[PDB]
């Protein structure tokens, strides 16, 4: 009833935070590379 409430709508946002958290993780993505100026560093 009201005892069932505590972690529930807590998870209605914490997992959403976690979804945004794991979301961003890769969004900026002899032979080592392909361009000569990229070799310069």
């Amino acid at each position: 009833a009201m005892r069932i409430v505590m972690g529930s709508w807590w998870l209605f946002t914490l997992i959403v935070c976690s979804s945004y958290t794991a979301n961003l993780a890769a969004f900026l993505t002899p032979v080592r590379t392909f361009q000569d100026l990229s070799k310069q560093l």
């Binding site: 005892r3 505590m6 972690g7 807590w10 946002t13 914490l14 935070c17 958290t21």
Partner: peptide, 29 residues
């Protein structure tokens, strides 16, 4: 990569132990 990340993780334990003592005292009476 995790500074205010685990803040809410402890906040849920706060409201947990809060209502854990609260309804227990309301119902053991």
């Amino acid at each position: 990569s995790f500074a205010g990340v685990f803040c809410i993780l402890a906040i849920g334990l706060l409201l947990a132990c809060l209502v854990a003592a609260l309804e227990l005292w309301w119902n053991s009476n």
